[model samples]
Target: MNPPPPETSNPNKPKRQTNQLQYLLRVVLKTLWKHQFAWPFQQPVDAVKLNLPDYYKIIKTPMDMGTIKKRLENNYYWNAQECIQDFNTMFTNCYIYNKPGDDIVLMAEALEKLFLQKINELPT
Candidate 1:
């Protein structure tokens, strides 16, 4: 008796890759801050509120903010919401993992939640 033929699947095929926007957003999560503290932390009651413009000036556009802005929006950073929206737009336009499952979808979902969380930390 002959053995069954080996499966033809090519495991070496390149996996679906994420775009620069995905990586850029991850970098922002670490560097961008609220009240001198990075994202996800509630500002300390004693900490003085820092204005975003000054923060941008001091940080001086970490992660090549200008390039990111040009890639997503045609302008500069305005606010957290605008930045987050630009990310969402990038994912929507470039990727197609809107359905459940997979790392890409998970990444997108996590980014969405994190953006909202970070946005809430902004000064009202």
Candidate 2:
């Protein structure tokens, strides 16, 4: 048994469905970001707000924004939605589950949430 051919190459298929993958990716990212999930709380005592720079040390994840941005440029060709999704996966797999080492560590998660918020805020 052979796999089916793509609709693009098939004579019976419509030609108007090009760029479907890009469109789908854009929609997925847009939908994910639509729900509010970030806080910009600047106060030291405020538990909800996450300070951006401080989040790196607080989160136990091995990656940082600089590294992430560079790699995205080099490999993913700067796909913003993909980068955001990668961050979401990294946070989900590594940070959200384990007990935070301290309040600072917890702040990292907040910062990550803020990152997602920023991505969502971008005009699609």
Candidate 3:
């Protein structure tokens, strides 16, 4: 075994290749935040301004891209799965609040498209 333990720090634990995945997340989020129709997702929903009183009733927790970015920087998500879940949650909230195939809903769809597109192109 060509195993080298530096200062007793054994490689017993399975550490997922962090750099690539971390970069993937960052790039994807950056692109999403800069997306033409991503502004709606970059911040929390304003129930007061929207005046849709029942918005929050259905969506207990509102998700936003900026908040997700903060969580990403804070090392909130342990893996990409959790990270992706937040995206889905964000989109789902919009779908729940807005009508099907609406402008914002379509934007969310486009966001998902770009996210998966970049993700699949990773490690290239």
Candidate 4:
């Protein structure tokens, strides 16, 4: 026997993969914050309603996100930065520096087009 292999971690652990969901969730949360958003402590995030640029602004800084996540969990959002840092780590872990698609591979193509459109519309 080959030592039954090593006891590896569950790659799909909610904690491990929460960043994937947060990529979209952060957008919803930030939008809520922009409007001084609050939840009943029971309602979860809405994933479909997202504004890409606004989402971009929300996760722009770890501090900005730390505050928001705390508020969402009613100050109970444990290890808030874990998700935020994981978001960052996953990006680089997947070669985000060289690939903008690190956020969500499925959404990357659409996001890339959106980014290009925004750039085209920007002032000189």
Candidate 5:
């Protein structure tokens, strides 16, 4: 009798695909950085915080508050994109990034828009 067909299922494919996309994003970000896309307005952490909206300062959850405080103390940024990177890391590492249709995504998106807006407002 002929052997049964090879297994056609891939249980780990989803995770592998997710990681590949994440790696692609990292590559794109690095390429942009190398191209000096973040020129003129450097030190985004310091610059953006000066005019940061109070809305971003509003802690969504108690855990988020602690995490925000720690992030403020433990991180630095060279430009607006780097600040966005921190938001990505913060929400992701805190297990909030994967929650779809959640307030966490809203807050991060709003915060990112604000940061970019503030970046434009900064004097060269």
Candidate 6:
């Protein structure tokens, strides 16, 4: 079957709704990518050079701040919630791989908090 039609007769309203979320998410990523606690998660975790044989084995789905930014710029994220989930997944990958007391693990929670704190003010 063919795809469903557009939500409404007018296209302008939908355009603004999408663009508003995109602009806000871009700002969120801009802040996060340069944030102090964002260092560890700025890029993909190099399991090979880092000698983490089990890193990928355990964390099947890996996410990072830089990748999220790429997705944001590439329009991979259609809304704020999808972007938020990926950020959480990045932190989740860290927790399951690293020890509870590890610095990397600790940094993630604080960073996620910052993410939450920042995104809370954004429009839904």
lDDT of 3 at 15: 41
Model 5 over residues 1-124: C-alpha lDDT tens digits? 1222222233443322233223223442333233322221112222144443432344232122223223233332223343345435544432442255555455545544544544444333
Q: Summarize candidate 4's per-residue lDDT along 32-101 as a digit string, tens digits.
A: 3333212211122222343333332333322233333543343223344543443343223223322453
User: Which structure is stronger by lDDT: 2 or 4?
Assistant: 2
Extract clashing residue pairs from model 1: none
TM-scores, all models, native as reference: 0.35, 0.38, 0.77, 0.22, 0.28, 0.79
Worst 10 residues of 3 by lDDT: 1-10
Taking all chains together, the TM-score of candidate 3 against the true structure is 0.77
Better of 4 and 6 by lDDT: 6
Error of 6 at 94 (Å): 0.8
Q: How well does model 2 score by local distance difference test?
A: 0.40
After superposition, candidate 4 runs with Cα above 4 Å error: 1-77, 96-124
Residue 57 in model 3: shift from native, Å?
A: 0.7
Once superposed on the true structure, which residue ranges of model 6 sit more than 4 Å away at CA? Answer: 1-20
Question: Better model by lDDT, 3 or 4?
Answer: 3
Candidate 1 stretches with Cα past 4 Å from truth are 1-75, 78-81, 94-99
Clashing pairs in model 3, backbone N/Cα/C closer than 3 A = none
lDDT of 1 by residue, 1-124 (tens): 1222222233454333233334334445444432232232222111124323333233221232233434333223333454565445534531342356655455545655666565555443
RMSD of each: 20.4, 14.8, 11.6, 15.8, 18.4, 8.6
Q: What is the lDDT of residue 14 in candidate 4?
A: 35
- Ranked by lDDT from best down, the candidates are 3, 6, 2, 1, 5, 4
lDDT of 2 by residue, 24-115 (tens): 33543334334243121111122134324443344444333333333332343224454565556555534543456655346556666656
- Name the candidate that leads on TM-score: 6
Evaluate model 5: give its lDDT: 0.34
Model 3 shows how many backbone clashes? 0
Error of 1 at 40 (Å): 21
Between prediction 3 and prediction 5, which has the larger lDDT?
A: 3
Cα lDDT computed for each candidate against the true fold: 0.38, 0.40, 0.71, 0.34, 0.34, 0.71
